[PDB]
Symmetry: D4
Subunit: 155 residues, 8 copies
């Protein structure tokens, strides 16, 4: 159905604390336990909540190097498919978007250090047949990073 | 200091963060009590910085996802005011000071191309520190996960 | 050769291509009998290539106006085939071979980024001649008129 | 929305008018399968409710000695109303037909016509660049017009 | 090799601007007897310094109102560089050509009547050539300065 | 305005290659008597067709074996584009200078003895100029073709 | 993995600056006994720390007036990265070669006599090589700083 | 004054800077006494500007080699202050004013990406003269020698 302010605040609270209890959740939305849990399921089935996940600290797991790699695919057949299917099998790459502009594709990957990166790029990214060109930048400082989408545009 | 079981939790949790101790204990092949101290222990540390509900963007009218490349003005204030402003802009999820010709990279979600129009013109570029902005748009999500790779710890 | 009076006709007609022979007789200080000949003499010659209804994009749900900067292959007939193709794509209104870094420039209209994505990925780039493309979108229309300047003719 | 108030014939009106904009209700109606009174009804509503914003004559640039079509990319300055004053001034330049605030490296893109490269030189050096807001300009020219129509596509409303 | 002095340099300075002075005139401007003056100038030619005497026309005056600078990029063959060079030599509208450093392989200086004329060249000749991978051209809005004259002061001690 | 006929142009073609001919020598190839042939070339040079006769020297022969094409950016100011234009005119090592379209504001053609002299130029004088915002220079590796001669077939 | 003692650093600081020193001279700079200076040093050399001792010459002194940096791009063909690598190793005019991140695939530092020398190298060697897709070179106008000495205070 | 022998001295010494005169005097086909005579004069002139020990970065924990393309502010003499500063930063081994888009180029070494970040953001960009910096990093070292070519002197 349509989301009303109640359905939003849930999403708002949950995008920030996705491991709450239905009890805690209700206590933060002015809802009764059962009526809360009903509305959350609706939201889940209707694709609105696509996954509950535990966000780790990159540094905590020795992942220092956060890479933004701008690749450029080949003008060949099934080059964009093979590439896509490949990038889906590389755990070091978390995200991947076909972008407007000079950049054909953009990858956000994590690595131990520059060595790890060098090995990745040289012996896997660039080895892929469909990769024609790669060009990568590194994060010096994380100004802001959240998974929480904006929701005021539904009020 | 992490160990093999300690880790296997993280892999499981990263993908299903809303598990029950009983369930998580099961997978990591632990008992609830010793499982729970570990999972806690890991949070105590900061290994897990948050559990979050991940939303479908289109599901919520946000169809337009932009990566903007901003270049900040060269002044002592410029970097901090801008930093403090971008933290207060909810349509922008991420922000990174990068290497290369791009000084700062912004990830943001918007309702449609018009919404973007008002954001950049009436907020982004209006900010005194913002000297120039240059933006691209996602045509296709090939892959998007939040789960870090962990095999380099084994 | 056009005289000051012919010039006034074309200027009036470029702005209201539906104007009556009478009001035209007025705006150009003439009689409707001769005045009509001047216009006929124009259409018939070839100064006036077309009269058109201009619609408002938003009005018909075309909120996304695109400018695509293509690069054609260095093929004997890549130039021909592509040109033939862009002629049949109703989403692309104009197409120019420019000077500079860009080989061709396309101005075209879409419903939304989705409609775009499908066009660029399944039709633009799928075309054999198209080597690479990079497009930018219209945040704001500061001015847009089909009327040419004519003061250089007096 | 355009599916709530528009039906087959209404969309055939706008297709036919976009290409032959200076007819008469009878002439047009004589081509959409209607009559000189009902056709007017639907027609007087399209241009009443914002659809048909203008009827215009389209001239041949070379015909009127305009043989140099230029696509200038301008970067505005980070003053304040730099963006206002520029916008206001672009509208006063007859040589500049269109002006758009685009995404990408370019801030604004102007489409303009001139007589010859001299005319253009004088325009850029003496006007575009002389304006206080214009920080930089870079311009390319049209070598060959592959396709140019003012008519929008409407098949997305069916 | 020759040894050039004040009086020989002046000869070259004077000639680089007035390539049509007589020997007499030239002899008075540099303060020499016509006879040895002449010898000198022939010596200066005989030494390879004076490559050519030419008349310089005003493009505008001969309806070549549009001057271009075309940054062309040559394909990767072996013969591409030579075929292209040898073809550019035969294009009269193309006056100069230079293999430059940086992102440009070759830079061309060419003159045309107008943009139609240019369009016709680029699309039907330059890009038609098998070696030309890509072209990217700009045009002269204003000629702030243009001289054939080399500087020679560095030679004076 | 002068109305150029088939012969007049020839006179320009032949001159553009050999600008030091004797009026007789010219008479003898243009198909004009020494009197008319003479008067015309004057009509031509007075009209503004023939703007000058110059000796063309060999760069390398005079130790100048480093040709530079500088792409410069001028600061947008009231006293900017003027001052720079006037300065470039008094810089002997810069032969030509063009305000061209595209990403470059100005293109400069300049000759130097070596990379060091260049260095001194750009650092101490080109970039020291207050109008000069940015400089980006390349160098000629090989001169495929260089002629002063304009084409004139378009007038036939 | 290292965490060298407060003077073991010093030895490598001094030796990076005066690499032909006599153990006696080395001792009077780090304030050790003349014997422990071949102990501390023995160890360091006997690891991988000191890769080599070289005489550094003055480029203009040997006529190499033209120091150039070349941004090369490999073909995304086959073993292009190998053949090229092995070839750059054989070109003595090319001192350094680094595979960088960014729009540039490879960066080369080289030295030449004058701009001509460079032209011959580029057209007749670099670009002739099968793997080299495009080259793009800038030159050094002025050397602000140049030392072979690595910073070591991060080990204290 | 720089004959064939003097070059065979320099070729040998650039590779083995700590070469025994006994050995050196052999590798050039000289007797010891006149060999020591030639090298001396070669360094008393300036040909041999320094003898130095070259270390292995990885060995000293400097994993990140990096090329920063600086751009100096066109101020009164930012050019001077910056130069004087860059000589005081030991992390930056070399700095060159190059032709092209790049005003200055710096070659510098660091421990890790964080060290780098600290330098750029708190030292490089904080200097008043620095208008912008863009930096690329060494993925792999195909070749690096301090020895110049000398065949051109034969
Ligand atoms: C798929 C991408 C390469 C599309 C391209 N960036 C464009 O703007 O059209
Ligand atoms: C802080 C940023 C301006 C850093 C810059 N993008 C770099 O390459 O180091
Ligand atoms: C209107 C402009 C300031 C827009 C900006 N250049 C962009 O890339 O989106
Ligand atoms: C048709 C295009 C490839 C022409 C090219 N952009 C030029 O400036 O010459
Ligand atoms: C005067 C110059 C700065 C003009 C500029 N190159 C342009 O194409 O608009
Ligand atoms: C060697 C190159 C292809 C590396 C690439 N330019 C990058 O930034 O990762
Ligand atoms: C002739 C060109 C291919 C030279 C190349 N642009 C360079 O900088 O070395
Ligand atoms: C010193 C630098 C600003 C010089 C500039 N890179 C040029 O090519 O002229
Ligand atoms: Ca692209
Ligand atoms: Ca979408
Ligand atoms: Ca930058
Ligand atoms: Ca809009
Ligand atoms: Ca191009
Ligand atoms: Ca034309
Ligand atoms: Ca911009
Ligand atoms: Ca002109
Ligand atoms: Ca090149
Ligand atoms: Ca030379
Ligand atoms: Ca490393």
């Amino acid at each position: 159905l349509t989301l009303d302010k109640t359905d939003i605040k849930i999403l708002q609270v949950l995008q920030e604390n996705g491991r709450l209890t239905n009890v805690e959740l209700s206590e933060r939305v002015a809802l009764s336990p059962s009526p809360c849990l009903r509305r959350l399921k609706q939201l889940e089935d209707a694709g609105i909540v696509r996954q509950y996940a535990a966000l780790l600290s990159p540094e905590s797991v020795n992942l220092g190097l956060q890479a933004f790699i701008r690749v450029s695919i080949r003008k060949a057949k099934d080059a964009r498919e093979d590439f896509a299917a490949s990038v889906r099998k590389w755990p070091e790459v978390l995200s991947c978007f076909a972008l407007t502009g000079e950049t054909d594709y953009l990858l956000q990957a994590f690595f131990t250090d520059m060595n790890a990166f060098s090995h990745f790029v040289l012996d896997t990214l660039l080895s892929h047949h469909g990769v024609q060109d790669a060009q990568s930048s590194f994060v010096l400082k994380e100004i802001k990073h959240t998974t929480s989408l904006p929701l005021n545009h539904l009020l």
